[PDB]
């Protein structure tokens, strides 16, 4: 292949400008998003229960749905919690790799089969299965700046006039409103109702007859009658449209003839659909939308569109609505690509820069300057072949390879440049002499390579989705990279490179070169010097890479391990959890003074705060509340104190003065839809019907038990809510059948008094939308209100609650937890200072293992991946290092000489270790890549250092000293010169600050440090390794030379 | 004062203790009027009741709806505690609101033991409920065949 | 794939703008182009003009007065003018429909409405003509 | 049965509509309801989607609105079917 | 049509850039896939 192309340099250059092009088109028409899909797929049931409590919607949806839950492929686990709002969630996680497209049709077939259980109010309100994992593209506000509109009317503007246009805008997929379209409000006074002997039964009934839309058939209908010359539709009633028609319902027509109209007993007014949220962005009502992106999708794409179509909508928009964006990870996503090609741009630089200090003529220095690009571009064609996108990890797997494709060029070239210096050849001829030296050698490092970075694509999990990354994009660079020397490099050489002297080493050459090569000249004969003196004495170097082997082990296992740096993404959360019965009007104040003092005490970091009043992560209730703050641009937050970390650490602090209320602020994950991370994720889990209290009691014991091993165990601490306080009413059955009361009367009266219920559709302004009866707010707040609320008895009296009712405090949940479908408490921890989270865990489980009879415990979230996934990493490297072993054997024919090359791994591995542990950073996922590619380029080299004196032995004679320290000679130039481009190139990334520094600081400083210890550390051992290794398994005359 | 309740509420004695020793209310309501001594009978934590008797808690408290920790403690069982409230002075006859009385509760759910041990301290077995219900009428409609003897 | 030849526009009411300002936005583009055939030829719509229909009106006050329920009238309407399917039956072994319709003769004419006779909870029978009024307006036969 | 256009569509066309969101490859929807009684909503996806998938994702947000149509058109059936395939034949049959 | 007019400049753009790049390996010539290439408007004007 190189002498084809030798002689059809242009033929090579055709080859690799079609593949720039291929790459540019792929770059073009790939999907670009901050991360590909990690999280294991899941599927979340959502249904609601307008005024149920937890229990009542746990035992009439959750379990009745949960019970149909079986017959589903690749199904994990199954968690669900049923709460005080009358809402439930059921989330269905499946396998990493699951189509989610099948898993969601399978939750789907079987919820729809069980729909005809629920009761006709949940399946009113839509049961609705929605893919769970995927990771939010957007959060949009809405306000209106002239304060002309509440909360309601905002979402209802939102709901008829923004949301359908953005779910069509391309590449969205899925969109949460927050608020509701309109709702007709039926508020009812107990006072006027009972002046009237009426109920919300016949409110009821009167709406459903006379808000009705009717089919009434045509005149002159088919079959007709022969000779009909008319046919017209027959219009009869129709839904109604406004208050004022829901005001003129005819409730009853007096004994006087007198009229009682619905307004006569009722406010009326559009409202919201329910109330339980408040939203607020910076202290004014709001409504929005929670816009997420649709799997594959192109998320730069996708957020361009929806700001587009957001401004073909805004001329429309009534006085003052105003849109807000206070999360769009299009800015964070921009910041990583615009790195990463300044990244590589300054690498070609410092590649160009080595490369005429040391070969000092420009025509070199052209030949990476190509073939690099040529192999980044055409690395994108083959990612998409595979169906991969650009994403933070694809990217940095690029920067991680730069240093292998930067070494492909460089040894090429500089192999050309010295056959020609030692030996006068023109160029044609020494690049064919040359890539006889090195492309069989080229071709098991590709094997090698491939051998090192492919098993890592088979972790299982989240990790293997993230580690699958990297190795695709590796793997396929290095591959093309190695294509690329053995047609367009080879070609480029020959018709490029100027000849060179025999002899000629530039040492007559004037000023700073001349000084340069005559420096380099003589450094190279002190390193051949010292090699050929360490290896008089070999078994004392032995002795020190021993000790290098165990202090690298000592070093790996004192080093913190962990998952993804967090980042500064320029948004972050702080929850807010009331004491039990806590009301929204406390959680308000409450959220009014965080708004405050972000808006004030850090009035220079800070543009907006999105504070909902209602929901927070341990679960929803007027208690819960979260502040979402979105920062200034990180341009305008200069230095260390105005980072997210600092920020929010400073906000807590402030916080810890408010008496009245848990508040606490924190960043998010890396990957938020995974969260997580850090700590374990424990179930408890009621196994024999023992009951919630009896479950919580388990609970509290193994949270105090825990708690007396802070040596281990940091935090535990459950989930979810406390039991409240709870107004028990128990109709007395044997008074409302005296009375002639009927129970349906009483349940229909108390419920849609004070829960509310749903009556029918009506039309507003040409939509359909919901109609709902409830009490006015101040005849439903307290227990004294009960009694204001009369039935009708058959015999016609009104009848107060309080004659057949009675009413006691009792402990209930708000929020009942199910795992696997039985009961259970999710239970949050992590490892004290220090310790494993492996090892935490298997305290967990021994407190755990003493609970009462009937408590079991099960992992889930990030604890289930380590619990099925820790037997991998050791058989995965021991797969590597054989097929390793086994593509050396071929290489150089031989079961022993492999071992010279394999021993080079312990000398990256340690300096990476000790820039990590120096600079206070973890083993997490860059630094294992960062790892990978060390000891990739450490091998590397030592297959060309050993594949050089194997061929001085095999094809010239020489004798095994000789022809060892002419191979180091050879290699010392092209290894120091990709060292130093590389330390250099990596350089900015590992001092680099801000957006995106936690990965650059994670992939830069373990690769720097083990290039330096792998670079400084190889040149006197590979030598060694080559001599011990030739000299312990031979047989005939190997130090002597021969013919 | 809101220290005390939820300790009494999670059953941690040597807090409770702090906290008078340090001065906290042992008559300290949380919003439904419910006292540490409340919270205690509820939960059944009969050394707590000990401790905050000892301390001057009002052993006749009651909540917003009338009812009183022996209320709580007759209801779901509580038999040492019903026995300890009743030694420190614990009304034997108070009706909640309902007219419900703590023999009412404990017939209610077939303790027979507290039930003796109500009558011996003077529970009235003919107090009315405000549907005109009495102990034995409970145990009638339950079909308890052993309590309705007793009553 | 029909078509091919020309262009398929959509006039859309984004605004709760209702039905009748709609297809005057419609006449209004139609016209206009019409004063272009030098560039568009055959503007038309694609689907059907409003048409007479007949309203007829339930007085809530009379009917319940007469004591005669609204379910009642509305179920009498409509089974009888527009049908109903009732519930299924087996025809040579094949399970088929039931419909419940006026006989033709008896649902032509506005002047066949007060035919129709509803009972009362007092028993008596109440025509139709008792609690009603009609009158013509324009709709939608198709509405897109 | 029965029904003139305007019930059809505000009680059957626009609770439907109202429900076909979180459907891939969408490339616009149209509908008609009409005199007869009748709804039509045709959802019109990218050349190239897969017919099956389009199909059941419909069908699935359809199924999740069945409740809240009016019993008179449950208990008619509604229909979701591939309607952009080609006609084969068209077969007459007469009684001569 | 309306999102398929850019389409047509750039395939043939494609396809005329890959025409003269598999002309230019066939005859070793940056500038000899030129005498091919301008061919094409002689059948073109026919079929027109
Ligand atoms: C948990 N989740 C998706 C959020 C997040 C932020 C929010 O600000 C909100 C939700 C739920 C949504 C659902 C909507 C719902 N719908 C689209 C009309 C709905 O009626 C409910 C409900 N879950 O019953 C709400 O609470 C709700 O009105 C609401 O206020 C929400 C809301 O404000």
């Known amino acids: ?1043 | 004062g809101k220290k005390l309740l939820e300790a009494a509420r999670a059953g941690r004695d040597d807090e409770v203790r702090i906290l008078m020793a340090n001065g906290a209310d042992v008559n300290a309501a949380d919003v439904v009027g419910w006292t540490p001594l409340h919270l205690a009978a509820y939960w059944g934590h009969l050394e707590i009741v000990e401790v905050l008797l000892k301390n001057g808690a009002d052993v006749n408290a009651y909540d917003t709806l009338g009812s009183t920790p022996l209320h709580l403690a007759a209801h779901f069982g509580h038999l040492e505690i019903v026995e300890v409230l009743l030694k420190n002075g614990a009304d034997v006859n108070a009706k909640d609101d309902n007219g419900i009385t703590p023999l009412h509760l404990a017939a209610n759910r077939g303790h027979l033991e507290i039930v003796e041990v109500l009558l011996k301290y003077g529970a009235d077995v003919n107090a009315q409920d405000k549907f005109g219900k009495t102990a034995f009428d409970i145990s009638i409609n339950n079909g308890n065949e052993d309590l309705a003897e007793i009553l």
Request: glycine share 8%.
């Open chain 1, 1 to 1043: 292949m190189p002498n084809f192309f030798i002689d059809r340099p242009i033929f090579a250059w055709v080859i690799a400008i079609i593949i720039m092009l291929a790459g540019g088109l792929a770059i073009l028409k790939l999907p670009v998003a901050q991360y590909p899909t990690i999280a294991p797929p899941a599927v979340t049931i959502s249904a609601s229960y307008p005024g149920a409590d937890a229990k009542t919607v746990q035992d009439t949806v959750t379990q009745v749905i949960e019970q149909n839950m079986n017959g589903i492929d690749n199904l994990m686990y199954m968690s669900s919690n049923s709460d005080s709002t009358g809402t439930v969630q059921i989330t269905l996680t499946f396998e990493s790799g699951t189509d989610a497209d099948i898993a969601q049709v399978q939750v789907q077939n079987k919820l729809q089969l069980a729909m005809p259980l629920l009761p006709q109010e949940v399946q009113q309100q839509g049961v609705s299965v929605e893919k769970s994992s995927s990771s939010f593209l957007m959060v949009v506000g809405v306000i209106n700046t002239d304060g002309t509109m509440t909360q309601e009317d905002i979402s209802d503007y939102v709901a008829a006039n923004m949301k359908d246009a953005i779910s069509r805008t391309s590449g969205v997929g899925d969109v949460q409103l927050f608020g509701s379209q309109y709702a007709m409000r039926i508020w009812m006074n107990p006072n006027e109702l009972n002046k009237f002997q009426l109920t919300p039964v016949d409110v009821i009934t009167a709406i459903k007859a006379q808000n009705a839309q009717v089919a009434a058939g045509q005149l002159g209908g088919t079959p007709p009658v022969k000779g009909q010359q008319l046919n017209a539709s027959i219009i009869a009633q129709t839904r109604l449209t406004s208050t004022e028609e829901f005001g003129k319902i005819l409730l009853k027509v007096n004994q006087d003839g007198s009229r009682v109209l619905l307004r006569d007993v009722a406010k009326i007014e559009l409202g919201g659909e329910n109330y339980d949220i408040i939203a607020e962005f910076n202290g004014q009502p709001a409504s929005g939308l929670g816009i997420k992106l649709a799997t594959g999708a192109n998320a730069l794409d996708t957020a361009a569109a929806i700001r587009a179509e957001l401004a073909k909508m805004e001329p429309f928009f009534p006085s003052g609505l105003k849109i807000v964006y206070p999360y769009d990870t299009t800015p964070f996503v921009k910041i990583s690509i615009h790195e990463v090609v300044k990244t590589l741009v300054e690498a070609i630089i410092l590649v160009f820069l080595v490369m005429y200090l040391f070969l000092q003529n420009f025509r070199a220095t052209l030949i990476p300057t190509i073939a690099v690009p040529v192999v980044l571009l055409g690395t994108f064609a083959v990612l998409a072949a595979f169906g991969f996108s650009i994403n933070t990890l694809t990217m940095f797997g690029m920067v991680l390879a730069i240093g292998l494709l930067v070494d492909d060029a460089i040894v090429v070239v500089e192999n050309v440049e010295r056959v020609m210096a030692e030996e006068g050849l023109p160029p044609k001829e020494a690049t064919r002499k040359s890539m006889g030296q090195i492309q069989g050698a080229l071709v098991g490092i590709a094997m090698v390579l491939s051998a090192v970075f492919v098993p890592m694509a088979f972790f299982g999990g989240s990790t293997g989705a993230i580690y699958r990354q990297f190795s695709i994009t590796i793997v396929s660079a290095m591959a093309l990279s190695v294509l690329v020397a053995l047609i367009l490099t080879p070609a480029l050489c020959a018709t490029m490179l100027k000849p060179i002297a025999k002899g000629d080493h530039g040492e007559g050459k004037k000023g700073f070169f001349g000084w340069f090569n005559r420096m380099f000249e003589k450094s190279t004969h002190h390193y051949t010097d010292s090699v050929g003196g360490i290896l008089r004495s070999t078994g004392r170097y032995l002795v020190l890479y021993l000790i290098i082997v165990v202090g690298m082990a000592y070093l790996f296992v004192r080093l913190p391990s962990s998952f993804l740096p967090d980042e500064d993404q320029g948004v972050f959360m702080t929850m807010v959890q009331l004491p039990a019965g806590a009301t929204q009007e406390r959680t308000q104040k409450v959220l009014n003074e965080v708004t405050h003092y972000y808006l004030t005490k850090e009035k220079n970091n800070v543009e907006s705060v999105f504070a909902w009043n209602g929901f927070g992560f341990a679960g929803r209730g007027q208690n819960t509340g979260i502040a979402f703050v979105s920062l200034k641009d990180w341009a305008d937050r200069p230095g260390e104190e105005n980072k997210v970390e600092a920020i929010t650490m400073r906000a807590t602090r402030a916080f810890s003065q408010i008496k009245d209320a848990m508040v606490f602020a924190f960043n998010l994950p890396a990957i938020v839809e995974l969260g997580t991370a850090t700590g374990f994720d424990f179930e408890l889990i009621d196994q024999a019907g023992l009951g919630h209290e009896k479950l919580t009691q388990a609970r509290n014991q193994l949270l105090a038990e825990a708690a007396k091993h802070p040596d281990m165990l940091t935090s535990v601490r459950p989930n979810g809510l406390e039991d409240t306080p709870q107004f028990k009413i128990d109709i007395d059955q044997e008074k409302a059948q005296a009375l002639g009361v009927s129970i349906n009367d009483i349940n229909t009266t108390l419920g849609a008094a004070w829960g509310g219920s749903y009556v029918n559709d009506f039309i507003d302004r040409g939509r359909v939308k919901k109609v709902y009866v409830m009490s006015e707010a101040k005849y439903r707040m307290l227990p004294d209100d009960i009694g204001d609320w009369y039935v009708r008895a058959a015999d016609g009296q009104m009848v107060p609650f309080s004659a057949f009712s009675s009413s006691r405090w009792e402990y209930g949940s708000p929020r009942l937890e199910r795992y696997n479908g039985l009961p259970s408490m999710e239970i949050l921890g992590q490892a004290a200072p220090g310790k494993s989270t492996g090892e935490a865990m298997e305290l967990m489980e021994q407190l755990a293992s003493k609970l009462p009879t009937g408590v079991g415990y099960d992992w889930t979230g990030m604890s289930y991946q380590e619990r099925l996934s820790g037997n991998q990493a050791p058989s995965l490297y021991a797969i590597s290092l054989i097929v390793v072993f086994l593509c050396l054997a071929a290489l150089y024919e031989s079961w022993s000489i492999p071992f010279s090359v394999m021993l080079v791994v312990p000398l990256g591995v340690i300096g990476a270790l000790l820039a990590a542990t120096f600079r206070g950073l973890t083993n997490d996922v860059y630094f294992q890549v960062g790892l990978l590619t060390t000891i990739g380029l450490s091998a590397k080299n030592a297959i060309l250092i050993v594949e050089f004196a194997k061929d001085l032995m095999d094809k010239e004679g020489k004798g095994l000293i000789e022809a060892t320290l002419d191979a180091v000679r050879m290699r010392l130039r092209p290894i120091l010169m990709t060292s130093l481009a590389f330390i250099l190139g990596v350089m900015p990334l590992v001092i680099s600050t801000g957006a995106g520094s936690g990965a650059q600081n994670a992939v830069g400083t373990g690769v720097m440090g083990g290039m330096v210890t792998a670079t400084v550390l190889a040149i006197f051992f590979v030598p060694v390794f080559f001599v011990v290794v030739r000299r312990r398994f031979s047989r005939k005359n190997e130090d002597i030379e021969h013919s």
